[PDB]
Amino acid sequence: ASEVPQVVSLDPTSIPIEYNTPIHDIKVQVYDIKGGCNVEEGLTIFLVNNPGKENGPVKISSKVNDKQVSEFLKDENMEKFNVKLGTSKHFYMFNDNKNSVAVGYVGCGSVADLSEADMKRVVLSLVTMLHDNKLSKLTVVFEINVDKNLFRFFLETLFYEYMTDERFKSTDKNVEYIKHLGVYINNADTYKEEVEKARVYYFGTYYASQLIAAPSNYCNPVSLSNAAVELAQKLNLEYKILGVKELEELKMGAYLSVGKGSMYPNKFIHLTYKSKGDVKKKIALVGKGITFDSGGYNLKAAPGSMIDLMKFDMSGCAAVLGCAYCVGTLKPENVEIHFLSAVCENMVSKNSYRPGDIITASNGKTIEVGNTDSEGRLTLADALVYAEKLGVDYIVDIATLTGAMLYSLGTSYAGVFGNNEELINKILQSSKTSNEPVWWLPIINEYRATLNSKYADINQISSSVKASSIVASLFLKEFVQNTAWAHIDIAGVSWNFKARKPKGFGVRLLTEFVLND
Amino acid sequence: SEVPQVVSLDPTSIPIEYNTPIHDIKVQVYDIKGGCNVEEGLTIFLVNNPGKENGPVKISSKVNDKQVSEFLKDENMEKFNVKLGTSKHFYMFNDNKNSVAVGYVGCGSVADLSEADMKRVVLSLVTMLHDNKLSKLTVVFEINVDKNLFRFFLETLFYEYMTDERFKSTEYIKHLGVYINNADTYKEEVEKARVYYFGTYYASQLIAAPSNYCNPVSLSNAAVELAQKLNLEYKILGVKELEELKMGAYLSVGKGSMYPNKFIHLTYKSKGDVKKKIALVGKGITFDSGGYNLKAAPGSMIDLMKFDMSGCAAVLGCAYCVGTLKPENVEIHFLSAVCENMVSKNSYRPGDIITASNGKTIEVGNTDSEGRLTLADALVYAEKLGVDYIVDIATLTGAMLYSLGTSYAGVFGNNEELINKILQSSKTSNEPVWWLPIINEYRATLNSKYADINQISSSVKASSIVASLFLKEFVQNTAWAHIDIAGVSWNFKARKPKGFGVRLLTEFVLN
Amino acid sequence: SEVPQVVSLDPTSIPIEYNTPIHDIKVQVYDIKGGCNVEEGLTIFLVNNPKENGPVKISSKVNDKQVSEFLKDENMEKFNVKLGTSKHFYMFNDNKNSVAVGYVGCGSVADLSEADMKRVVLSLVTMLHDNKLSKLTVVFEINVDKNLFRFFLETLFYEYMTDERFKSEYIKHLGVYINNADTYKEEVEKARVYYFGTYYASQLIAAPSNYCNPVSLSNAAVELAQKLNLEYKILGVKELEELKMGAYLSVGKGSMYPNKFIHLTYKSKGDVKKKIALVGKGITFDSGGYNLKAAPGSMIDLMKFDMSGCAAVLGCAYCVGTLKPENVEIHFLSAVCENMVSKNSYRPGDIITASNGKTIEVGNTDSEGRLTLADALVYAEKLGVDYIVDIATLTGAMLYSLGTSYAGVFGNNEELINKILQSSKTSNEPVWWLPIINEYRATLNSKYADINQISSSVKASSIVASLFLKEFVQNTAWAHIDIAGVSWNFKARKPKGFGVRLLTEFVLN
Ligand SMILES: [Zn+2]
Ligand SMILES: [Zn+2]
Ligand SMILES: [Zn+2]
Ligand SMILES: [Zn+2]
Ligand SMILES: [Zn+2]
Ligand SMILES: [Zn+2]
């Protein structure tokens, strides 16, 4: 751990991380539907659909072990409510023991097979009923048909949206969290091995979200690397933080040039998880770690640049650290995973690197900088050369690289590039089981000639092709010569603009990829 | 002298190639009335047809090879046309039964080749040299060139052939034969062309050098090395001496840089008696970020702003030629106020009032107009030397792209005789330059309410003329001229510098 | 001939006053030798001090004891000669009559430029606009040649006159005291003719586009030719279609006003030994077409002056028609139209054919000035002239090259360029020679048409446009004056009438 430099004594010297969230205190109990439901204290919610009939009537098909509540939930009373996706209603009644209970439902539409987006819409309605109410238990009854991955996704998303980050509130606050969660589902014994898997995947996403949402005066190269050391110490992971003196010896000129104009020294994070049984799989995960992207002398001054959001330019690093928690907790075997990130800050200063400067990567390649705001591929280039030297089988990088993703895939799907069938297909398969959507995009070799520099070995940016995401992959491909490599561009999907919060995108996708090899 | 670094990987010197492959070519001129000999790689005939639109190229020189003479017969060559730039390659056996290659370049139908057309002819010639591994090239001038145009042919041949590879990491011909009429009168142009070539290429090397390599300290380090490799008196002025000369305008521009200001002062003096004292001043901004007036506009071209020291490179490139040819009855001072215009907590602000070394207070209206601030203090320094002519050359205003464009430089001045000395030098050096006026009506728009003078105007959008009006206030009695090369310095199509200004200044000193 | 209207309240003619109050001013020039008489009105001394911001010193004998005491060196030293500074006082003369005496500072330079002269007049006109005088007397204590003396009169008359045609007490005598008075006398009535030619063109330019349209401008051109007795013929759409003027007719395709080609002719009484064709760009309103002037800085609100070249040409027709030069034939041409946005407008990318058969690829509809001039230049060349001179507000790049003071001249014959420069010296309308750089010609090579209308790489629009017009003059000495930056006086919010006096001096010599 290094000392965080400060301009004034009021500058923060560490990122606040919440490890023991109220989600961790929720006792989760799952029961089988073929045994009846017991309407207890708190709120009991039914997940109901109606296949074929758009906005069809509500019909409860589960045995309720209460004569009074069964009379309330009869077909001749559900009738006036429909199953439109996202609709919710509250019921108040008295049970057989003359006790007042609260019951309700959330409509799951028709369609029968709900997408990840549709399930989020259902979960958001569920959270609205959990909000502004002081319940001690919530019970969810699954009268919709879901597989194991979608059931785990339901719990992960519910935990994540229910959780509220108040680390930076002072004068502001309000009300409490439920202490128990009940789940009724057919074949319940098969679904509940996913419960504690969902709790692990939740915190990894929330931990990544905590690091992303942390501003750049809190989350800087020094404090971000310190948090990775702190996380590795709790999970007993091997760790090494590379300082400038070691990065100078490794000749990481591309990575070092980006951080020249920062008051925080560059810090390269290298975490390692090793298995007990002999290792038959070696994987290196690389994340872009720019704690703040001012753009450099190519300053983000255009209206659409969204510079006030550029604290999220380390979303790739947070996704890898979130994976380090999930992998470090569940402990898969026969794998070595290397969690890497070249962390720095891209600022404007007398010491900053200039547009037009020619820099040398750690593999000997010289690069002519055409735009200082394209610093991601420069830091990733040195990180990929470092990653390949570790002798791994797969290299997967994740980065908020290009704003062009907002104009290609948008805010819902991330893009994956690569040089190999199966690493892309294994990543695409992991997107299916993790329910984090990713789309395969091409590396068009015709654009490679536009990176031909007149003086340096290669140009950092193209001079003609406006497809920045594809050109960046072509540039990064030049720094992986022999290893299977894939690249995930999450620049469009990392931040939830409507909810004004991070998504923690990549944690579950990367973890599922490690666990399925 | 020591280059500061942020990290240990920051370079501390500009890589400079002094012995280029062009210097290894033995250039050899023969008279065309005597026959051409064929026996090597590539032989090229320069052919025209004055009158016929794209008429047939006609071989007129006697070739001392029976078989190659039969190939070049009029009933044979007929097919090919003379269109300016066209080229074809031939293979055949000579009188010694050895395999040879011959070709031609079309030179159009204009008996006097234009000074831009000869560039197109040279570029066509270079294409045959690039994808080829030839050992010797022979050029037969079957077209009219005067002595100045012939030197230009070699200079353009030398410069375009040469390849800049100082920043690459992860063959050239050895003999050049020229068959030309009255070869004895052109012979003296061979070594003058090679000297002009390297001066231009040495300037291109400084311009193409990026800003992390080419900084105020490393650029002045190259100047003392060049002054030492030649034999000019040299002194580099550091911040401490510039403060005592009270050059506040120049010091304010470099305030926000991590590199200290360095003022270059080279001097060549003649052995005999001196009848002319000349000061050549070059704007030396190693990198122009624009300051707090940051170049963020779309057409700002921030990635090319390493070229804002091209005027300094033009002065140093001319210093090599002068230091080599050693003209007489002349004293030349090579001046440049070298610094870097950065954004920092130490940078100077829009609205700041600064004082030049001649006492005039300047209200800064735009930090991107930093070149005239460094030039102003350099002009006061130049006039203090007691010279007869002061010529400054600068990539001053981007408005040159919309006035004269990328081909013609603009010249301003307060003395029309000096302008014709520059315009005459532009003609013989073959670097085109057009005379533009200093319109005195715009001078009132530089009237500052609080300082002595405004740095920029607010009403007049003719920045090239307004900037010249600003510099004119800092030359009190000496004849002065100003060359604005902001539009012609960089060759955008070739993605490399032109080295513009080296030969124009050398021809100005030599005549 | 009949102006079309959208509504019955749309104007159908441009208003012109031919009889201005300036024409009623009796001008008398006296020699400073023998003393000055200060009886009535306002008397102003034009004084310099060759130092900087030096004191005022009157050196002329005043034939009034009371006014002489006011002009004593001790009393006048409290005022300075800063260029533009002025003070005027009211006092009693020897006859106890109310008189006004003052000065206008002319700096510390002996030879005044045309811009310095403009500044001196502006101070004089401001004093005339705030006083109710019957006579103005100017005492010349500075050196001016006969051209600058005439330029002083033209500029004084032009700035003094106020255009009130769109709105809803001038002096009656002008006295001038100057050493060597007998040589300057002949310039008085030439300045009055030069003044109105400039003021006439200003009236056409300042007239808004709803008043000045292709029909009403050509109608006004016919009226001027009838008042002067010049030949006139106006080409309609049917005749322009027979001449195959595809470039000129394409620009006006989207306008509600039909195209009108102005062709005026002056011819001498003696034998003709020189024939000259003057072409003026006459775009009554330039919206830019589908390349609309919408970007910041395009100044779409001022675009009624895109016919300034035509107004300069028609103003030259008045000056020539009045002074009646000899042994010369002058043709005043203008391809008048309007560049608007409509379903009938021509589009970017359209390929059009000029009257000489060349196909043109339109790359920008706002570069319509070179399209109308191209067909106008072909028309002029068929007339068999010695010189073709066109004047146009062609390129906005002129504001960034030469600015608002100097016009740019281009040409294919540097003997004719020399003649126009010389007229710039005598007319005192400043013009600077700019090059036609042939290296840029290749960038006008179209992939599909014979030639491109605009370049896509060279940002030197003033030179590229001159290269385009050069392709339509095969035979004749031709020159081109770009007055886009100098035509409108932004400080005074009014036109300058630029080109009228320059072209007239070119014709007379
Ligand atoms: Zn960036
Ligand atoms: Zn970034
Ligand atoms: Zn600048
Ligand atoms: Zn500059
Ligand atoms: Zn236009
Ligand atoms: Zn126009």
Give the pairing of strands C275-280 and C329-339.
parallel
Extract the tokens encoding B67: 């078989």
Q: Per CB distance under 8 Å, which residues of A are interface residues toward B? A: 244, 248, 251, 253, 256-257, 260, 297-299, 301-302, 348-351, 353-360, 363-366, 368-371, 454-457
Reported as type and span, the H/E element at residue B234 is strand B233-237
Q: How many helices (H) and strands (E) does chain C have?
A: 15, 20
CB–CB contact B464 C401 (8 Å): yes
Do B403 and B410 meet the contact criterion of CB atoms below 8 Å apart? yes
Q: In which region does residue C257 sit, left (phi positive, over 0), alpha (psi from -120 to 50) or beta (all else)?
A: beta
Do C409 and C432 meet the contact criterion of CB atoms below 8 Å apart? yes
- Report long-range pairs for A423-428 (Cβ below 8 Å, ≥24 apart): A423/A394, A423/A396, A423/A484, A423/A485, A423/A486, A424/A486, A426/A394, A426/A513, A426/A516, A426/A517, A427/A396, A427/A486, A427/A488, A427/A509, A427/A513
- Tell me the sheet residues that pair with A358: A368
SS3 of residue B133 by DSSP? coil
A80 known ligand binder = no
> Which of C108, C298, C400 has the most B C-beta neighbours within 10 Å, making it the best mutation to test the interface with B?
C400
Looking at the annotation, which residues of A are catalytic? Answer: 300, 377
CB–CB contact C459 B408 (8 Å): no
Question: B386: buried, middle or exposed (CB in 10 Å: 19+, 13-18, 0-12)?
Answer: exposed
C118 known ligand binder = no
Query: To what resolution in angstroms was this structure determined?
Result: 2.6
Q: How far apart are CA C24 and CA B446, in angstroms?
A: 41
Which candidate, A91, A89, A71, A92, places its Cα nearest to that of A81? A89
Q: How far apart are CA A293 and CA A308, in angstroms?
A: 10
Tally the residues of chain A. 517
A313 known ligand binder = yes
CB–CB contact B437 C461 (8 Å): no
CB–CB contact A350 B257 (8 Å): yes
Extract the tokens encoding C508: 């007379």
Name the closest residue on chain B to residue A455, using Cα atoms: B167
Do C100 and C90 meet the contact criterion of CB atoms below 8 Å apart? yes
AA letter at A242: L
Chains C and A lie in contact, requiring 3 or more CB pairs less than 8 Å apart: no
SS3 of residue A67 by DSSP? helix
Q: How far apart are CA C389 and CA C274, in angstroms?
A: 14
> Which of C111, C436, C437, C444 has the most B C-beta neighbours within 10 Å, making it the best mutation to test the interface with B?
C437
For the beta carbon of residue B66, count every other beta carbon within 10 angstroms.
9
Question: Which residues in chain B are contacts of C491 at CB distance < 8 A?
Answer: 459
Q: Pseudo-torsion of CA A473, A476, A482, A485, nearest 10°?
A: -50
Do B317 and B429 meet the contact criterion of CB atoms below 8 Å apart? no
Q: What angle do CA B298, A298, B494 make, to 5 degrees?
A: 60
Q: How far apart are CA B472 and CA B466, in angstroms?
A: 10
CB under 8 Å to C382, separation ≥6 — which residues?
A: none
Residue C344 Cα to ligand 5 midpoint, Å, equals 17
Which candidate, B206, B48, B168, places its Cα nearest to that of B120? B48
Breaks (C-N over 2.5 A) in chain C follow: 50, 168
Residue C370 Cα to ligand 5 midpoint, Å, equals 9
Which candidate, C356, C195, C161, C371, places its Cα nearest to that of C283? C371
Do B126 and B163 meet the contact criterion of CB atoms below 8 Å apart? no
Q: Please tell me which of the candidates B407, B440, B442 has its beta carbon nearest to residue C439.
A: B407
SS3 of residue C81 by DSSP? coil
User: Which ligand is nearest to the Cα of residue C394, counting in written order?
Assistant: 6
Tally the residues of chain C. 509
Inter-chain Cβ pairs, chain B and chain C, closer than 8 A: 75
Do A496 and A503 meet the contact criterion of CB atoms below 8 Å apart? yes
Q: What angle do CA A112, A115, A120 make, to 5 degrees?
A: 110
Q: Please tell me which of the candidates A350, A359, A363 has its beta carbon nearest to residue B344.
A: A350
Question: Which residues in chain B are contacts of A253 at CB distance < 8 A?
Answer: 9
Provide the strand spans (E) within A131-281: 137-142, 180-185, 238-242, 267-274
CB–CB contact A253 B9 (8 Å): yes
Report the gap between the CA of B343 and the closest CA in chain A (Å). 6
User: Which ligand is nearest to the Cα of residue C305, counting in written order?
Assistant: 6
Cα–Cα distances (Å) from A46 to A124, A151, A194, C302, in that order, read: 15, 15, 20, 70
Which candidate, B20, B21, B26, B23, places its Cα nearest to that of B138? B26
Question: Which residues in chain B are contacts of C404 at CB distance < 8 A?
Answer: 460, 462
Which candidate, A331, A486, A324, A468, places its Cα nearest to that of A416? A486
CB–CB contact A369 B303 (8 Å): yes
Do C319 and C193 meet the contact criterion of CB atoms below 8 Å apart? yes
CB–CB contact B170 A457 (8 Å): yes
Give the pairing of strands A484-489 and B87-93.
unpaired
CB–CB contact A350 B294 (8 Å): no
Query: What is the DSSP-derived secondary structure letter of residue A304?
Result: G
CB–CB contact A256 B9 (8 Å): yes
CB under 8 Å to B359, separation ≥6 — which residues?
A: none
Name the closest residue on chain A to residue B254, using Cα atoms: A350
Q: Please tell me which of the candidates C113, C400, C437 has its beta carbon nearest to residue B402.
A: C400
Q: How far apart are CA C334 and CA C322, in angstroms?
A: 20
Breaks (C-N over 2.5 A) in chain A follow: 175
Question: C448: buried, middle or exposed (CB in 10 Å: 19+, 13-18, 0-12)?
Answer: exposed
**What experimental approach yielded this model?**
X-ray
SS3 of residue B384 by DSSP? helix
Q: How far apart are CA C278 and CA B167, in angstroms?
A: 58
Reported as type and span, the H/E element at residue B150 is helix B147-161
Q: Please tell me which of the candidates A349, A358, A368 has its beta carbon nearest to residue B344.
A: A349
Q: How far apart are CA A468 and CA A154, in angstroms?
A: 35
Give the pairing of strands B409-413 and B479-484.
antiparallel
Q: How far apart are CA A23 and CA A196, in angstroms?
A: 12
Extract the tokens encoding C454: 């605009």
H helices present in C402-492, as ranges: 416-427, 461-470
Q: How far apart are CA A132 and CA C499, in angstroms?
A: 79
Which candidate, C495, C151, C505, C470, places its Cα nearest to that of C309? C495
- Out of C150, C260, C293, C496, the active site residue is C293
Q: How far apart are CA A269 and CA A274, in angstroms?
A: 16
